[PDB]
Amino acid sequence: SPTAAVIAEVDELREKIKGSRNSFRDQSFLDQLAQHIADAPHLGRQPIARALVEDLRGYASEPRLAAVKAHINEERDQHIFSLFDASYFPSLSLEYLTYETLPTNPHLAARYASPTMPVNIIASSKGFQSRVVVALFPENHIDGIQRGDDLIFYFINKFVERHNRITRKMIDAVMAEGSFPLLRGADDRTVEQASSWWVRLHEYHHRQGDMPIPEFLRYKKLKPLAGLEELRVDVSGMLVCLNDPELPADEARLAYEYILSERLLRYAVEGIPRPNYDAVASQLLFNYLSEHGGIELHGGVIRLCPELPAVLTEFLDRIQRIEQRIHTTSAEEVQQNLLEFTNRYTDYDPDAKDYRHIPFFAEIKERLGV
Amino acid sequence: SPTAAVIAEVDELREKIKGSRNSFRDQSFLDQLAQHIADAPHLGRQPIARALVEDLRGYASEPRLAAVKAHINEERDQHIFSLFDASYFPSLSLEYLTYETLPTNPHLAARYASPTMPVNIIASSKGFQSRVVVALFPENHIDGIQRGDDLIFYFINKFVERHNRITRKMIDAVMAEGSFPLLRGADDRTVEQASSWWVRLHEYHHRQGDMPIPEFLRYKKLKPLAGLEELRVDVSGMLVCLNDPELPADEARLAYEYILSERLLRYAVEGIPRPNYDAVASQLLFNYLSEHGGIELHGGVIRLCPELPAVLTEFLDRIQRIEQRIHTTSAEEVQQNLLEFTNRYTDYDPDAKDYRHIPFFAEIKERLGV
Ligand SMILES: [Fe+2]
Ligand SMILES: [Fe+2]
Secondary structure, X not given: OHHHHHHHHHHHHHHHOOOOHHHOOOHHHHHHHHHHHHHOOOHHHOHHHHHHXXXXXXXXXXXXXXXXXXXXXXXXXXXXXXEEOOOOOOXXXXXXXXXXXXXXXXXXXXXXXXXXXXXXXXXXXXXXXXOOOXXXXXXXXXXXXXXXXXXXXXXXXXXXXHXXXXXXXXXXXXXXXXXXXXXOOOOHHHHHHHHHHHHHHHHHHHOOOOOOOOOOHHHOOOHHHHHHXXXXXXXXXXXXXXXXXXXXXXXXXXXXXXXXXXXXXXXXXXXXXXXXXXXXXXXXXXXHHHHOOOEEEEOOEEEEOOOHHHHHHHHHHHHHHHHHHHHOOOHHHHHHHHHHHHHHXXXXXXXXXXXXXXXHHHHHHHHHOO | OHHXXXXXXXXXXXXXXXXXXXXXXXXXXXXXXXXXXXXXXXXXXXXXXXXXXXXXXXXOOOOOOHHHHHHHHOOOOOEEEEEEOOOOXXXXXXXXXXXXXXXXXXXXXXXXXXXXXXXXXXXXXXXXHOOOOOEEOHHXXXXXXXXXXXOEEEEHHHHHHHHHHHHHHHHHHHEOOOOOOOOOOOOHHHHHHHHHHHHHXXXXXXXXXXXXXXXXXXXXXXXXXXXXXXXXXXHXXXXXXXXXXXXXXXXXXXHHHHHHHHHHHHHHHOOEOOOOHHHHHHHHHHHHHHHOOOEEEEOOEEEEOOOHHHHHHHHHHHHHHHHHHHHOOOHHHHHHHHHHHHHOOOEEEOOOOEEEOOHXXXXXXXXHOO
């Protein structure tokens, strides 16, 4: 395999530089790295590698990876290759992958447009094989730069794997029978499509509203607020799937079921020993929905109520009421009001200033090992 | 089996009340629970069950489990049986166990006296089988009361299991050859004895110093400070093992190696996706010792320096100099100074107000699956 030969060369260079991350912006390091990439038998021949060589050799005066990103953003081929520094994807250093794109609904693509690339990884270097790395953002490159039109990659194969290994088992154990009928037994191609819909709607809605990101990113990085922002856009995508009639009805209901099942179940149990940001917001959704008539609990099993679409709209309306006051109060004041709302429906420990898994999901974590 | 019949009856009652935690202090609930306990053909006739039935039936006028705790604290037998409500042990509701005590070193128990019970669990109800439940504290009972002379149980069989599952393969992968010679191939009884020394010294030193807990507990619940307090007492215990000549030299060196291997390795990788309280403090220790000459990194491997005992003393001395200013500044000012000290040696994200696993241990988590 020619691709495996190229990837073995990247994996070996990755091993050599593993101890030198503090030098990743050092021009003496960058020159040696560029030189080794250039001299690599198979890898050095590739256009994207030549682009990275030029970006690295020029980094002292221009600390950007402009030629690499031009290649990637223009989709000159289906290869990604760069030097990465992403604190939440620690496995990434010098990495290479090849991807395949997925089909997309044309109305979805046109009406909810964003520079999102839902892709399957075909082959990759060691750092991309970590289950942690589910996406790739432009500021993950060492230059730390993101532009509004930079392509953003989501690795749908990893989300299909997660849905099969975790969500499917939580649906069987936690949901009333008939809860997610289109998802029941659906094949990987089907979940693939739903997941690709989810990420396209997800990225689009991050840019909508009164406190979009990245503009208000530094106000939305506290654990409960980062999760709440994730939830804001996924509830938005849920409602689009229910409300936009130009979307194919079968595919839209399937994407609805996927987003809801992921936020109600898989994201709800994330984090040990405390909930992570996604899980705090999902437990907020669970309790809000239970208290406002959107779901019901019958002997530890969740029933989705027929009124759930109206309750989801109410929940999204409530988030938007809080955020709209950015127009008349400080971002700090909106923050405090988003925290207050979150804390009404989650298990907040005021002395630890952190959250505990609400008892409903702590027991499922124990029962299912999730 | 008679104990098996008792615990089966406990587990069935635990199942019946599982959805009723909000009713655990309501007398109508308690009156019915007490009756079902009394009528359990085997459980109801245990003296400990008689005690609990009496406490519950009288909870309306005296909200405490005085008869149960008298039984337990007096070690009338080796059974524990109560109604629990411990937010960090969510699996505990109506629970039962039988334990066995362990050999005890006389000088250790006399010079470092505390009401600590290092025990092995022989049989237990379902809630005590959770890997989370490594200990039982007096305030974990529904009454939420703790007294200084109440017995505190540590389940040593669970620390042995954790040592063999995590620490051992971490020692093999991460430590330079000959780092922990007494622990190599140590049998379970040997680890058990080291672990019992550790918990006794652990509980003792919590009560010592200028900001002991429980007095200053509410200032030491923030994630970095909860970890730092655990670390303060374990480094104190390490140093006692090195410095107290009246302890048997073979057991003391073994306990030293055990406490260090646990704090340097197993505790340093806890928490997903972020480090938990133990792990932040262990990463503080790792980076402190690296920069101050106590350990050295060679080829990704930790070498313990011969100077390490003096660097551990310097580390504990530093913590104590910060805490000593409680005498001339507020508890809040000490808190900031403990946080500033922690953040100098850990990966703190000021916008998330939380920590990331430092890259050394993030890579180990990925590599070994810990
Ligand atoms: Fe997002
Ligand atoms: Fe402790």
